Amino acid sequence: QAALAVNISAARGLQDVLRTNLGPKGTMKMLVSGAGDIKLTKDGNVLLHEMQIQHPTASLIAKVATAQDDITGDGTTSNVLIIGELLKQADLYISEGLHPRIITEGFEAAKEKALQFLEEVKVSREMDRETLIDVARTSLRTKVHAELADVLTEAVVDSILAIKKQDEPIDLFMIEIMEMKHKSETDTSLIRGLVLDHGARHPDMKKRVEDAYILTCNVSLEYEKTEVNSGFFYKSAEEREKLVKAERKFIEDRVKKIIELKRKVCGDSDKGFVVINQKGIDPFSLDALSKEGIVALRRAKRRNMERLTLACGGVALNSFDDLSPDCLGHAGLVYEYTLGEEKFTFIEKCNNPRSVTLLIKGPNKHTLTQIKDAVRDGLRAVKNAIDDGCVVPGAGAVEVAMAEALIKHKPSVKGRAQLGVQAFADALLIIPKVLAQNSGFDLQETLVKIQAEHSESGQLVGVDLNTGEPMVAAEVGVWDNYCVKKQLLHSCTVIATNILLVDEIMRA
Amino acid sequence: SGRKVQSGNINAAKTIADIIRTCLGPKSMMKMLLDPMGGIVMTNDGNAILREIQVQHPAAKSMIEISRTQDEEVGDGTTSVIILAGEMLSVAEHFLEQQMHPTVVISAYRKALDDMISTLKKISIPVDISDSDMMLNIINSSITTKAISRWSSLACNIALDAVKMVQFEENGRKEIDIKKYARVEKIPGGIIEDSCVLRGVMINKDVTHPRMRRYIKNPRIVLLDSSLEYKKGIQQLCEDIIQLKPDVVITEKGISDLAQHYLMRANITAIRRVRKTDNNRIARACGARIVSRPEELREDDVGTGAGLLEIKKIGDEYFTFITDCKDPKACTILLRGASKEILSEVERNLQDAMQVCRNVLLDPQLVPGGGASEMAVAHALTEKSKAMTGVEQWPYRAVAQALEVIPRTLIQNCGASTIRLLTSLRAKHTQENCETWGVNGETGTLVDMKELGIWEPLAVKLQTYKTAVETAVLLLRIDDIVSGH
Amino acid sequence: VYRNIQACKELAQTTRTAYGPNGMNKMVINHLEKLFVTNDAATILRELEVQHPAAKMIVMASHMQEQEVGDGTNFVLVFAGALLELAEELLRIGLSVSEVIEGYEIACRKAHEILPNLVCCSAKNLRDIDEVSSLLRTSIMSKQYGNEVFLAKLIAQACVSIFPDSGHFNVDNIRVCKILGSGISSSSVLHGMVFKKETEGDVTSVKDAKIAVYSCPFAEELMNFSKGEENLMDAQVKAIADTGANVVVTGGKVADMALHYANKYNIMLVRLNSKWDLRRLCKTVGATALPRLTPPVLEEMGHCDSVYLSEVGDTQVVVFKHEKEDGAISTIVLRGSTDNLMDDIERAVDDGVNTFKVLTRDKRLVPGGGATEIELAKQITSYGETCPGLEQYAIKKFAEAFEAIPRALAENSGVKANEVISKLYAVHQEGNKNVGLDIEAEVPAVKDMLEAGILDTYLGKYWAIKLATNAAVTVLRVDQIIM
């Protein structure tokens, strides 16, 4: 009776808060924390995961929405707008009776009709470079500046078309985003193979490695000593004075094992023996072995070594010795690059060059984070477009045609479910409206123009976010993902039903 | 203290102007008047809004006074005057804060006004008078959008017949004209088409016994404020009249039957209970003179008045139809109809068109309305300001910038965006050489002004601009108000 | 969003006064309750309690500006404030924020492409000490008025011109050492860093010095303990003096036994090292700080060229010169009555050296003192009418925000700003680029800058304009946050 009204008000408030974010031309919000550090972002997922919401059921909506749509690429803010509009439209009929179950039946029937419509509208144009360009641009211009997105589209699309050779979509490890703080943010490219965070204390050991062999195996040039005896150095410090010694024999054992490894699998000072340590190493043994042609470094994280297993090769055990070099692999180039003060090791052209890392040079922390999120979103969107193989006309093209199909589907359903279907259509109509409003033009001017021209066009058609003119998104380059639409519709219907079925609230 | 009173004055001006900012044009947004008695008032006229509302700030009171004067001087445009004054003061607010004296600002405003007066005449399109075709086009253009839409024929014919019946050739060629000396005869009865025009003055007062030669071939009217008595034991006025031998005498009081026969012997027709508001037009139409001193009496006391008098009785009313008098300067226009609920506004619009014709005689110029003239003068000022030097150039540009408020409001109160339309109008108007495009008021769509066919008299727009600028300088020249409250 | 705009506007206003050679300065009090007098706006901001996030990111933009150029930060602040207030009134008109952003971006690109069209660059080279000294006087004149600019330009530039080798320079090479006492006119320039030392037991001509770094500075039973402690201390100083050590550096205090033992080791016991000097010494002599007295290492042992005592400045000091570059290190010794003006003088020295650096990286110079600002404003506002569309409003507002620099420069210098602005703008049609404002005359009079020699870096102004536009754009595109 009134719990429904409370939920409606909370959902409308959340929708109104998230109104001015949809679309590339939409403005962006900024997040402030108690510490003082601020984040500047526009993506709905991070906004809902970071906002401090007052109303409880609004927090419910945000949490469940993020949880469900983590599976698909994005569309979070569009989903929130559609569910808010659904609730408002249902309220305009509930306020005069209209028991929520009938509205639920109408919603489910409209969902079925919209699913069939989307199935028969989806366009299966064969994949090429140009379509990937268009998808990357559409998915990137909605998270970062215009020209920055234009620069980043080429990098992301080239990386993704490189990845696509496996004929199966895989992600996470195979694409790595490195972060650094060069002033020139315009520098953004891709590096094949691996890029290591940093190296060790080596004065011009190998540099241009060219051909190399990778064994790693967490070398022990600074093998752990026996420092821990009882708490700390007590009056009985002879343990931490002498027992801490005699472990240099481990370091010399590793040195000699690498010695015959190098002059067994190489036979010359060339062909850099690439090894890594998970902790620091002593410069003495390090440069003594590097002067023999061994590429030894230190202080690397795990993710790089697991990537080395699949992209370079070689086992990795901290406690080890010389063993079968069968696991060892080869690298085309292990050249090291330094920008200003910190060293980057470019492990590229290696065996299985499928693994590729992405390079950005953001000036400060928040721009770096926004760039990382934008490139991740673009990668996910293009991967989904690869997987479905059938892109769909965006810019509100599918939504308006879906609304028209639902309206023409009104007499098909009996009972009072027609009211639910009509409300569902009017709610799905929100997306082009929000696009036009965020762009700056009048709401209903653009909406009426688009509907009127789509009446005779037959083909799908969107909105140009530069003049308000209707535009055929198919021929321009605006594209969305089939799976995104599927998951959005399904989750939207589910959450709308769940909220509408509530009757009363009590404490606990 | 100091400039603070100026800021308060201009704030009051801005907050009184924007109240009725949105109520001009063919699609004026309507307003509410809620008296503290529960009543509710339906009103569109901003002049009526300000007349009904009451305000305490003296500057707002002075602006009410100037609005009323402009209403009673030239006619319409009072809302435009108020809007222009408010916008000019609001834009001068920034310069007042700029720590510049009001003297330089008002000097810049004066120079801008001088420039505007010229550039208005530069762009005004010529018009012809008494040319029925496009005069009727003007009637369908501006004299419309009132309650005479279905009855425009009566208004047009009345105006065209009565334009040449109050003209005064005092110092030039019929350029002196008044809308009050005309005999408007607004009586209900019959059909509205019964209204006509006559060359003379009509009196609603008549003798109780018109069984006499009330009309003479050449009446010689002489005004007399004295009332005739039975006799001296005053009869002496009868012999005094007999000395000069007139035939018509006007008095403000009744005449007895014996006194009526005495005046019949005096060979004069006695007219009683006349009204001063009608006696003035009697004297104007007949050229009468009043004198009673016996020493000053001469041959000039009595002069020729009417030419063909007559009295009829229409609608059981004692009419008095003087026609074809000596001077066609105070003639008759008849106003009949079944009801008078709209005919008053009809005659108001008639006097509006009368001012239109009078100023057309003054200056046969029409300005392209609908924001076309405003944008033209703003463009002229902005292009002329490039050569101007010194600090005074900024007000000379801000007055032009603030003058574009009229098309802004026209576009605003029709649904269309007030930004894109204004930008399109300005951008295309500059490159256009002599186009003067004016936005349509109904659809809120750009259109060349000749095709739309709307225009205003040069004199009325000139007066509006002059009053707005003078109000701006007057309100900026106030340095303090403390004389009590 | 008007809250953010107003906050940034107040932030810009509170530092607008300090702009120009007539910087009418402020008081500085921090949490630990000092009292400084300073006119440098960059010095003002670093102790302002800025809480509004828009202010936080505008001062972040200012910090980015100073890290790339080194001056004009106050210009960035005032330009951003003008841009944001004009954007505020544009929003009040009814324009969308995105349209304003687009207009500002296109106006910024127009400004960058029009800037290099009025450059009157340097004369011949970084050499000719007098010529470049005349060049580098503008920034220091802005920091400190013309009372001492003529001495300051020679003092600062003469130090940076010591090592014009291979066309490479470093700002950190020219450090500043402060000596209290006589007036500023008694300032001097010297080679090699100058700082206080304690012991005078130093030989003038020395071989390769051995900089011993002190990371950690200093009945019968009483006699026994005293003897043991003295012997331990003597062993410690013997260990310090090992490996051919000849000199030491310490942040501690002298001891009579310690100084005597060091002197009879022919080693001076240098103490009283400032908390900043030791990192610079270590980085310039190619060594590191020795942990204690007993573990010194010759591998991490300091060597620059030699060590001796300089009497310049009416005091005894320590000097290290002739590094691996043999001329890279060159400090400047200053004299002053108090310390509250030492900060301003060293700030002016930095404002000279960084402008010299950007001159090295860009030998192109544009007229200053309101010349370039009004010229670019005129160019952009003339281009605005040509460009149709809705970006035109943002273009004129960008030009108006650009022309606000000479307005503030005139106003905070005493002269009425509007008169100066109007006269300058009217003159600029005929009195072209080189015209500029006159500081001396109270009447609003103008004067050509080419003869005045008041010029500012082309690259500096370029980067300042770019970063101000970026900051204004990134401020305009926010809506709100929980607060």
Ligand SMILES: Nc1ncnc2c1ncn2[C@@H]1O[C@H](COP(=O)(O)OP(=O)(O)O)[C@@H](O)[C@H]1O
């Ligand atoms: N260039 C463009 N023109 C018109 N519409 C666009 C353009 N780029 C993206 N869109 C629209 O933006 C929508 C996605 O934006 P949004 O929902 O804000 O991002 P997210 O998917 O992260 O929630 C898509 O439905 C698409 O139609």
Ligand SMILES: Nc1ncnc2c1ncn2[C@@H]1O[C@H](COP(=O)(O)OP(=O)(O)O)[C@@H](O)[C@H]1O
């Ligand atoms: N059809 C029309 N199209 C455009 N503008 C019109 C039209 N009719 C009237 N206007 C505008 O209305 C204004 C006159 O209104 P106004 O004189 O203020 O009325 P009042 O004085 O009775 O309040 C003119 O400036 C003219 O531009």
Ligand SMILES: Nc1ncnc2c1ncn2[C@@H]1O[C@H](COP(=O)(O)OP(=O)(O)O)[C@@H](O)[C@H]1O
């Ligand atoms: N004598 C002068 N006359 C006119 N303008 C000057 C004079 N000296 C310096 N200026 C102006 O002062 C500005 C220097 O600003 P500055 O105070 O260095 O900024 P910041 O404090 O951020 O480094 C220059 O742009 C220059 O135009």
